[PDB]
Design a protein around this ligand. Structure first.
Ligand code: NI
Length: 534
């Protein structure tokens, strides 16, 4: 209550706030949540953090409706330190095209606009960097990486940067594709980041720490060798080659949670191991009692105490009927996982039903699918589609309704074309839907990322299905993650150099300890690729 500095965090109670609070505590601070203006007072507050995730209007409506506008402005006028994170940063602007009708605090007189997806995937999901500058602050290091996850940004041009400079604003710039945008701002007592420091490992914690202690340490004195190695060369649009570690979560006989089919601290510990070994993100495949007491939620909550990178959970995110008969829609189930520590949810089977219905309605959605409800509330960046396809040959496009493509490898009868058929219920059942049609429908519906598995390569340890990746990349404009088949570092290299995969996921190879995320990163690094090394 006074035995340690107190940090007040404005909580609109929507989204994952576990990471931010755990980071602050981990830094030696006590967290005081502020769900209402009644929960804090100007003079009694020395450190205020405004975290925000999701649709711009959603967050700003919520915030302003609870009466935080005046309290926030007054606090800012008090001259005391305030930190905005992600939407907290956007809230400082005039508004956002994401929610046309919305209005911000307008400290910066222009709106956030959507990234250009003609040249790159949108949303931006990954590790970008601040452009070297003389006016960086709070320790922002151009040679480190921070995690960004957003479709909208304060996109810059010469005119806006000049006005900002004349307005006395210090701007940390970043570039995604050919577009420059505000990664961070600083003017007097106001500080805000577009990236999630709490989701940016040690580099992130340093930023929060530098803020809480109000200090801008100089960046390390790297050697010219190190700089050339650590600098952003803007390959892959400026994002590092994202390495994802995945683990299964099962309930054995005794009813305990384990990762292996034969054995809840195991899943937790492994996730921690992964994080410690460089994983840029950890995915839990929930394959395991009232919703409130789901064991998976505890794994996430426990993992979130020390794992400061994005967490993804797939499985069970759908409309459900609780133990008391209460009907709980997908949206509320997701919110439960998010508030528990998850940053993204993976939709599998329902994604196929959604896509199918989507075409039935003539390429439109009814806004009732988990994809639509969750993405509209939390943004596309929060919804991941897990796809489980299987190659199917045909003599020509004339043999099927689904889009096919000329393959370099002929079929049993010499068929030179093929499409990938999707499956559901753990790949136990097939559907008359191609992956081309499935991904395009889900994207239209609001999915922000595609987890591209491959039934045929799963468990093989012989590399990814490269034509599949390219096939899906031709289909959608959202990030595509290569999964299934990864066995050795070389497979990651092949995917990043021979295909347009936006990330690579590994499971068994990391689980069996054959290699670590770092082994893979060292390899890629040694081969000219850019990887997060924190
Ligand atoms: Ni105290």
């Amino acid at each position: 209550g006074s035995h340690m500095p107190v940090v007040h965090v404005i909580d609109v109670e929507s989204g994952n706030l576990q990471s931010l609070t755990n980071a602050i505590e981990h830094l030696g601070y006590e967290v005081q949540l502020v769900k209402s203006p009644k929960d804090f007072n100007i003079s009694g507050t020395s450190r205020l953090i405004l975290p925000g995730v999701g649709n711009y209007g959603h967050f700003v409506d919520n915030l302003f409706n609870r009466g935080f506008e005046k309290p926030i402005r007054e606090y800012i006028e008090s001259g005391k330190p305030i930190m905005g994170i992600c939407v907290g940063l956007q809230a400082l602007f005039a508004g956002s095209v994401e929610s046309p009708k919305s209005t911000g605090l307008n400290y910066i007189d222009f709106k956030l606009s959507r990234f250009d997806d003609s040249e790159k995937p949108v949303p931006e999901i990954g590790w970008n960097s601040c452009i070297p500058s003389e006016n960086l602050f709070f320790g922002l290091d151009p040679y480190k990486r921070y995690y960004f996850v957003h479709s909208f940004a304060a996109i810059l041009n010469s005119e806006k940067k000049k006005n900002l400079e004349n307005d006395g604003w210090k701007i940390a710039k970043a570039k995604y594709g050919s577009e420059e945008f505000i990664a961070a701002v600083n003017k007097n007592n106001i500080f805000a980041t577009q990236f999630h420091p709490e989701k940016s490992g040690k580099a992130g914690l340093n930023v929060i720490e530098n803020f809480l202690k109000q200090q801008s340490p100089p960046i390390p004195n790297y050697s010219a060798e190190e700089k050339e190695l650590l600098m952003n060369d803007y390959s892959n649009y400026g994002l590092t080659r994202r390495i994802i570690a995945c683990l299964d979560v099962r309930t054995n006989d005794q009813g305990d949670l384990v990762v292996t089919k034969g054995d809840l601290g195991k899943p937790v510990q492994l996730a921690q191991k992964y994080y410690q070994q460089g994983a840029d993100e950890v995915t839990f495949l929930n394959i395991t009692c009232p919703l409130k007491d789901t064991p998976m939620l505890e794994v996430l909550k426990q993992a979130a105490k020390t794992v400061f990178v994005p967490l993804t959970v797939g499985g069970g995110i759908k409309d459900i009927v609780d133990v008391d008969g209460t009907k709980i829609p997908a949206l509320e189930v997701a919110s439960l996982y998010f508030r528990s520590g998850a940053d993204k949810v993976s939709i599998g089977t329902d994604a196929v039903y959604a896509a199918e219905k989507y075409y039935e309605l003539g390429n439109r959605g009814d806004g009732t699918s988990p994809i639509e409800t969750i993405s509209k509330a939390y943004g596309a960046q929060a919804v991941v589609i897990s796809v489980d396809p299987k190659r199917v040959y045909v003599n020509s496009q004339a043999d099927t309704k689904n889009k096919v493509f000329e393959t370099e490898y002929p079929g049993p009868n010499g068929e030179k074309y093929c499409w990938y058929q999707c499956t559901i219920k753990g790949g136990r059942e097939s559907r008359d839907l191609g992956v081309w049609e499935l991904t395009r429908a889900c994207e239209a519906l609001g999915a922000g990322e595609i987890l591209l598995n491959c039934i045929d390569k799963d468990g093989s340890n012989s590399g990814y299905d490269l034509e599949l990746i390219e096939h899906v990349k031709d289909a959608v404009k959202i990030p595509v993650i290569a999964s299934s088949g990864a066995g050795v570092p070389e497979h990651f290299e092949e995917a990043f150099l021979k295909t347009r995969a936006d990330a690579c996921l590994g499971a068994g190879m990391f689980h069996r300890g054959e290699f670590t995320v770092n082994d893979v990163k060292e390899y890629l690094l040694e081969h000219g690729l850019k990887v997060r090394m924190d």
